[PDB]
């Protein structure tokens with residue numbers, strides 16, 4: 871139940887796929903990995 875704050879303007883890195891914006895490329899890149907079909911999954915927690 872987050873406040874619901876969206877629409878900041880235009881970020882240097884956006885996930886056109888869904889619309890997830892980020893500050894740096896990496897941050898976003900890691901997010902996009904959620905869309906990609908392939909799955910690698912981590913090792914441990």
Ligand SMILES: [Zn+2]
Nearest residue numbers: 885887888890
């Ligand atoms: Zn996305």
